């Protein structure tokens, strides 16, 4: 059985149905235990929460999902009428994410889109998306830059749209950080989470779009 299947089984066995906090804790506990991800709730979850609270988005796009942790984390904060779109190419991960949201009682806040972002971002207009208020870029860091370009080119960003990208500790290729920092179209903030230690545990980049030039 896959890691993601085992994460779901553990939630099913230990978390309280319809309780997002219990789901998040159960995922966090099991992953920290297995040394798969260290205290995601403190390293990335709190930054996710504060960005969402700071900008109060009505429409969020999540690019990338694995076991549904991030989708639950975000959907649990959205106000009535606010919605999360979660786009993921791998149907197994999308299926776990769906079941995790069902278990948490958050399925009515989320639309899961299964497919490649190159195919689906240009079709977001068909989901009644004019522009996005926030984008969370997760897991597949080599997609961050090309996905950002596609969002720009499809007119899905407006002045004030917030991009938040996870796991940007080291430069990679394609280099998302160099693009958003270099461009005068994005105002950027870097977050480094150390937890109680001296070494970075997770790094995130917030890039706020200044509007089309
Ligand atoms: Cl905040
Ligand atoms: Cl996830
Ligand atoms: Na910039």
């Amino acid at each position: 059985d896959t890691k993601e299947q085992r994460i779901l089984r553990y939630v099913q066995q230990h978390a309280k149905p319809g309780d997002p906090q219990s789901v998040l804790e159960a995922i966090d506990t099991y992953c920290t235990q297995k040394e798969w991800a260290m205290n995601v709730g403190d390293a990335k979850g709190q930054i996710m929460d504060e960005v969402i609270q700071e900008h109060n988005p009505s429409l969020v796009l999540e690019l990338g999902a694995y076991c549904g942790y991030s989708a639950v984390r975000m959907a649990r904060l959205l106000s009535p009428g606010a919605r999360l779109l979660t786009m993921e190419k791998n149907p197994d991960y999308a299926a776990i994410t769906q079941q995790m949201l069902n278990f948490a009682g958050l399925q009515d806040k989320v639309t899961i889109l299964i497919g490649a972002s190159q195919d689906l971002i240009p079709q977001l207009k068909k989901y009644d998306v004019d522009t996005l208020d926030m984008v969370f870029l997760d897991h597949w860091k080599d997609r961050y830059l090309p996905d950002t370009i596609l969002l720009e080119e499809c007119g899905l960003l407006r002045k004030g749209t917030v991009l938040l990208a996870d796991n940007v500790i080291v430069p990679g290729t394609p280099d998302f950080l160099a693009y958003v920092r270099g461009s005068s179209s994005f105002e950027c903030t870097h977050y480094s989470s150390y937890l109680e230690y001296m070494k970075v545990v997770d790094g995130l980049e917030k890039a706020v779009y200044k509007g089309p030039s």
Side-chain angles (χ1 to χ4, degrees), residues 1-2 4-8 10-15 17-20 22-33 35-45 47-52 54-88 90-124 126-198 200-213:
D1 263 13
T2 57
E4 64 267 16
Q5 254 155 4
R6 297 162 63 188
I7 297 173
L8 179 58
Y10 184 99
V11 173
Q12 287 172 330
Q13 292 162 353
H14 302 74
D19 185 340
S22 176
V23 172
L24 295 172
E25 290 168 9
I27 293 167
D28 193 340
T29 287
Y30 184 67
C31 286
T32 303
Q33 183 248 298
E35 281 159 34
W36 295 342
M38 252 50 61
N39 313 267
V40 287
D42 286 341
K44 96 176 187 168
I47 286 159
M48 291 170 68
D49 292 354
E50 82 184 53
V51 173
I52 287 186
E54 179 185 11
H55 298 266
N56 193 29
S58 300
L59 193 51
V60 184
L61 174 65
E62 174 185 353
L63 289 163
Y66 183 59
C67 68
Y69 181 91
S70 297
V72 173
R73 188 92 196 191
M74 291 187 287
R76 96 195 198 282
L77 301 176
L78 295 179
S79 43
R83 290 193 65 75
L84 173 62
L85 305 158
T86 297
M87 184 180 302
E88 172 49 47
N90 183 319
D92 301 325
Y93 302 165
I96 295 304
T97 294
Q98 180 69 80
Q99 297 173 269
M100 194 74 69
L101 290 158
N102 289 341
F103 193 97
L106 291 168
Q107 70 277 6
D108 288 337
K109 305 296 282 172
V110 187
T111 308
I112 296 173
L113 293 76
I114 302 170
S117 63
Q118 303 96 304
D119 296 324
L120 291 173
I121 289 179
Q123 296 188 74
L124 279 173
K126 302 180 189 178
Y127 295 75
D128 286 346
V129 178
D130 181 19
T131 58
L132 297 161
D133 302 316
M134 177 174 169
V135 183
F136 186 62
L137 296 93
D138 201 11
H139 294 299
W140 325 126
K141 63 180 297 208
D142 289 349
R143 290 300 313 165
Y144 294 176
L145 181 49
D147 285 353
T148 296
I149 296 302
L150 276 168
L151 293 166
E152 281 184 69
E153 292 180 312
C154 294
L156 290 162
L157 312 180
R158 45 101 175 159
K159 179 162 146 74
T161 300
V162 184
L163 311 191
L164 180 67
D166 189 51
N167 192 28
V168 288
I169 302 175
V170 304
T173 305
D175 189 340
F176 172 78
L177 296 182
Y179 176 72
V180 289
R181 290 188 192 161
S183 173
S184 61
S185 289
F186 294 93
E187 201 145 288
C188 295
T189 309
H190 194 72
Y191 305 79
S192 290
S193 296
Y194 292 85
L195 300 182
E196 66 189 90
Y197 313 97
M198 300 170 287
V200 178
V201 175
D202 195 7
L204 299 94
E205 188 82 0
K206 186 174 71 175
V208 180
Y209 188 59
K210 287 177 95 148
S213 197

